[PDB]
Design a protein around this ligand. Structure first.
Ligand code: HTG
Ligand code: HTG
Length: 488
């Protein structure tokens, strides 16, 4: 009955994964969650917390193993070592689901509406907050993101994605209750609470501005990862990108190269950047591109700016530096010939400012975020400005090809657009390159694993959202209310 349960927690946990992309099955989030809620019924604190652990291990285990595809091909570690690192990651994250189920069974032992719809959402908010906070965090696989093409999307520009996580744990809980006690009362309250925001799906917190419509192009280079940083790749890369960029120079007002597309130091690319900038300002176009900067011996993962209304200068401020690093790591991959020899000294990154002004470019304001940073809703929100015309993010997702990793990243990126009511310009090396609407919709997209340019028209938008104005604290107030009430 119990062991049968645990096998079950693993199963409902892995059922969690199918809510996210590329599966896009959003009710699987509810099923997964009420799986957790219901399976934690009728058991002692510890056994329960172990069930929570098994649930989390189902989820993260089925859902972020793609980290392997990175560390195994590009770390070079034995093999069993890699698999160990992955299973350890999943398990570590499942400590949190266990802390959730733990404190839940300890402080609220009986199968009630109190437990499923008042305790669990507040507790889950704090345990997920922790999961995303401790050790710089890893807020990956939050069920709210499944609602991006789904109803409930309305909540996000009001109180953010975490409010959708809240509402989903609540609703799923009441369904768990309704189910195991065969009582229609929790079911009814579930359906009501789930359906209240459906009309929020149609509020437009923003105003289109067709007068500022432009042609945008994003060059998807598709430099193979293994080579990407070889001294003998550099020029084929600069040629690939320059030549993709050249026939658009009179027609596309704005062009983006993805993360560290220019795979060399800025100061070592001064002549190329100056000529490119000169040709750009002549033809009337603008460029935004990834590149690396070693400043005086601090090394920054960087976006720089060139072209019309944005003349290049190594001393310009119109630049962005990546803020969020993995608690270890973020180095520059070595030369191919040097990667097998390493186990038998790399350059690591320094952090850019938590708050960095928009990039200015051709009279466009761009709130930038590099790669992973686009999943940090709060940080993006803080860097966001009322005058911001677009969200910018550039990434290299080639570390995990063909995995679900890229699609999960993409999905979470859409939520920034929805949250802040701005279009999102998403440029990738081989990853998912796309233009996302001010409501998280995918306006334009190009296939991955292709060398290709995305070219389309984009219309920026203005005006704040409740979530733009407030950020997290209304949901935090709701949480504190719920939790302090939850101590009865
Ligand atoms: C014909 C129905 C007979 C069963 C009535 C009470 C069964 S027992 C009850 O059932 C719940 C769901 O199975 C469990 O979660 C709970 O721990 C258990 O005590
Ligand atoms: C500051 C450095 C300026 C360098 C000027 C080089 C411009 S070369 C470039 O050549 C292309 C070849 O077809 C022409 O189509 C394009 O119009 C011209 O801008």
């Amino acid at each position: 009955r119990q062991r049968i349960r645990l096998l079950l927690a693993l199963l409902f946990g892995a059922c969690g994964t199918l809510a996210f992309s590329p599966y896009d099955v959003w009710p699987a989030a509810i099923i997964s969650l009420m799986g957790l809620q219901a399976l934690t019924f009728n058991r002692r604190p510890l056994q329960s917390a172990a069930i929570g652990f098994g649930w989390g291990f189902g989820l993260f285990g089925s859902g972020i193993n793609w980290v392997y595809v990175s560390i195994a091909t590009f770390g070079g570690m034995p093999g069993p070592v890699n698999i160990f690192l992955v299973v350890l990651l999943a398990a570590y994250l499942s400590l949190y689901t266990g802390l959730f189920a733990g404190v839940l069974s300890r402080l609220w032992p009986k199968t009630t509406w109190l437990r499923v719809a008042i305790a669990a959402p507040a507790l889950w908010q704090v345990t997920e907050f922790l999961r995303g906070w401790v050790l710089t965090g890893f807020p990956w696989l939050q069920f709210g993101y499944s609602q991006i093409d789904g109803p409930l999307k309305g909540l996000a520009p009001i109180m953010g994605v975490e409010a959708i996580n809240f509402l989903l744990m609540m609703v799923s809980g009441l369904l768990a209750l309704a189910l195991v006690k065969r009582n229609w009362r929790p079911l009814v309250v579930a359906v009501v609470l789930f359906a209240l925001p459906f009309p929020l799906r149609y509020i437009q917190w923003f105003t289109p501005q067709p007068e500022k419509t432009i042609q945008v192009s994003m060059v998807q280079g598709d430099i193979p990862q293994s080579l990407k940083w070889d001294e003998g790749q550099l020029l084929n890369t600069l040629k690939i990108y320059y030549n993709a960029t050249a026939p658009l120079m009179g027609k596309s007002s704005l062009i983006i190269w993805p993360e560290s597309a220019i795979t060399d130091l800025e100061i070592n690319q001064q002549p190329f950047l100056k000529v490119l900038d000169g040709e750009l300002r002549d033809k009337g176009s603008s460029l935004v591109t990834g590149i690396v900067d070693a400043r005086l011996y601090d090394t920054y993962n960087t976006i720089i700016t060139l072209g019309k209304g944005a003349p290049y200068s190594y001393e310009s401020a119109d630049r962005y530096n990546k803020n969020h690093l993995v608690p270890f790591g973020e180095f520059v991959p070595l030369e191919s010939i040097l990667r097998p020899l390493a186990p038998f000294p790399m350059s690591s990154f320094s952090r850019g400012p938590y708050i960095q002004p928009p990039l200015s470019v051709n009279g466009i304001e761009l709130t930038a975020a590099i790669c992973y940073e686009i999943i940090l809703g709060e940080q993006v929100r803080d860097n966001f400005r009322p005058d911001t015309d677009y969200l910018l993010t550039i990434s290299n997702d080639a570390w995990f090809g063909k995995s679900i990793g890229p699609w999960q990243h993409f999905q979470m990126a859409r939520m920034r657009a929805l949250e802040l009511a701005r279009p999102l310009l998403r440029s990738t090396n081989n990853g998912i390159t796309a233009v996302i609407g001010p409501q998280g919709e995918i306006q334009a997209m190009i296939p991955q694993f292709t060398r290709e340019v995305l070219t389309t028209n984009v219309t920026p938008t203005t005006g704040l959202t409740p979530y733009a104005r407030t950020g997290n604290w209304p949901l935090w107030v709701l949480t504190a209310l719920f939790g302090f009430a939850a101590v009865l």
